[model samples]
Target: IKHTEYMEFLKSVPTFQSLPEEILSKLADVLEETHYENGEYIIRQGARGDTFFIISKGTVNVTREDEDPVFLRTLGKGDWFGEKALQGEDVRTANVIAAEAVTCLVIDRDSFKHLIGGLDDVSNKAY
Candidate 1:
């Protein structure tokens, strides 16, 4: 996707919508786009997390650790996961797998911390 497409996607997120345009632009600068093929593991159960992700397209399944990978939920465009990392839960509790080809915006943990600290409302929402 182009820079402008990312900017538009960022603007669509509720947590990012209230940010000043400049700050939003800065976030867009640091954001990275990633693609996952069908049946790929996006996050492994019990693995440490270093980033949060927002699905830009397609679907992903959140699965449990103990169960037989039963689908707990499906996340699509505008849906996000891994906010638990912001609350200092560094380990992922479940496996996230791409149910289909997917595109996502990845926010580095450190950069996310900076962005969250700058917005009281967003911080509150996360907590």
Candidate 2:
């Protein structure tokens, strides 16, 4: 029941739209739910990261280190980040912090690669 609900949620997300139902279902099953408090750092710049995050609720601030820290943009529910780490770049280029309380669905690198391996065919098939 819960799995089917999550699958429906993922199906509507643009990032997962290109995926077939098989992989999408697998992804839904693999997701781990997590929460954060306001001002919590989800991912930090220059950190070695292998987790991919999909926001389930609330918003996050994308920031980067500069003289202090530069504000990038805000990401809300259905937005995702850390994909570069799954694609081979292990360094986090920006810091992601919860602007308010947030809920996220996270997946680890190995499972991410295994589930979406062949989807790269669609990825690199850029017209």
Candidate 3:
């Protein structure tokens, strides 16, 4: 999709909705779109995390480690993750695996920090 299309898509997200036009436009440019097949781990617990994700399609099972991995919850389209990483957490707290073939948009920590720190005015106060 084009940048305008990405901008429109990002607008639907709670975190992106209130972003300033400049930041949102830049985010639209930097956002990376990727696909994952079923059963693939998107992010793994205890591993270094550098990116945040926005589910564009399909579901993911979010889990954290245990004797066996403990199921956290399922996330579907429009769901977001890795906020801790965006906030400077060096490691992931949970594992996110594809429950089905998935499409996701990602923004790494540097890019996220740039946008977040550049915030001017928000249409909403909370994300």
Candidate 4:
């Protein structure tokens, strides 16, 4: 997508909404677009969290430990996961599995920090 379109998309996300346009553009510049095949593992439980994901297409399953991998939630376009990583939580508590071919925007930990910086209002509202 074009930079302008991506920025418009970013505005739709709650976490990115209040951020300035310039910050959103900077984030889009570093964001990686990733694809996952059906049944692919997006995030593994107990692993160190280093990225956040925004679903651009398809669905994902959120599963907890030892439990029958339940379809706890579905994240479509603009929906996201891994917000906890921004709050200094390094371990993933649940597993995220793609239910189908998925396209997502992946934001690395460092990019996340750079984008938000030390803004308390955004942090407090986000967490």
Candidate 5:
């Protein structure tokens, strides 16, 4: 996508919608496009991850290792996950499994920290 297109896409995200233009430019530069097929595990519960994912297409199931990995919900286009990973180096609280083919824009924890001066700042701006 061109710069403007990237800006528009970023704005659609709840966490990034209020960022300064220059910050958004930086984030756009680092954004990674990722694809996954049906039944894929995007991230597993209790695993550590450093990426945040925004679902650009398709559906995924959110399951917690608690209750023996029962289904929590399904997320589709425009929904997001892995934000907790962006917040800190904590074990994943749940598993994200692709229920259908999926496309996502991903950002690593460092890239996200660089964008908003870490999670505290991210939380302040997310609303």
Candidate 6:
């Protein structure tokens, strides 16, 4: 179920457009499904995170933690974030809160690095 679903979905992602189905299959296998309750924070500003997220369902609000949180934008299905953190250790710059109950497919930094390592020439290129 996940294999076919994610394979086709991954193809549409701009960053994954260049990756072939073989790698996409491998990526799909590594994906971990996650769910968030409405109004829950999926990611917190200034916190360290090593996982990348792909929205599978519902919407999320992007906000910056100011004196009071500042709303940036809403991202729904097919939108993704936390990829940059996979490249190296980094602190989250904003908070991602579920505007509705949300489902996400996640991949940890280690799996991402190892999976991409399966391709050298292409992987080393622009992300």
The whole-model C-alpha lDDT of candidate 6 against the native structure comes to 0.79
Query: TM-score for every candidate vs. truth?
Result: 0.85, 0.85, 0.84, 0.80, 0.80, 0.80
| Cα lDDT tens digits for candidate 4, 1-127 | 6677678888887756878888899988888889999889999878888888888789888877654554556677777787565677688877888989898888888987777644454466431
Which residue pairs clash within candidate 2? Answer: none
Q: Candidate 6, TM-score vs. the true structure?
A: 0.80
Evaluate candidate 2 by giving its C-alpha RMSD to the native, one decimal.
3.3
TM-score of 4: 0.80
Which number leads on lDDT? 2
Candidate 3's C-alpha runs over 4 A off are: 117-127
What is the C-alpha lDDT profile of model 2 across 23-96, one tens digit per residue? Answer: 88888888898999999999989999988888988999998886788898899988877776566578988899
Question: 1-127 in candidate 3: lDDT tens per residue?
Answer: 5798888887887756877778889988888998999999999889887887889889999898768898889989877777665454578888999988899988877886667534432212232
**Residue 100 C-alpha lDDT in model 4:** 94
Rank by TM-score, highest first: 2, 1, 3, 6, 5, 4
Summed backbone clashes in each candidate are 0, 0, 0, 0, 0, 0
lDDT of 3 at 66: 67
Per-residue lDDT for 34-108 in model 1, tens only?
999999999988888888888999999898757366667888988777766566678887888998989988888
- Judge candidate 1 at residue 16 and give its lDDT: 71
Deviation from native of the Cα of residue 61 in model 1, angstroms: 0.5
Question: Each candidate: what lDDT?
Answer: 0.80, 0.81, 0.79, 0.78, 0.77, 0.79
Query: How much is 114 displaced in model 4, in angstroms?
Result: 3.1
Per-residue CA lDDT of model 6 for 10-35, tens digit only, reads: 78767666777787888898899899
Give each prediction's root-mean-square deviation over alpha carbons: 2.6, 3.3, 3.8, 3.0, 3.2, 4.0
**Location of the lowest summed lDDT over 10 successive residues in candidate 5:** 118-127
Q: What's the distance in Å from true for residue 77, model 1? A: 0.4
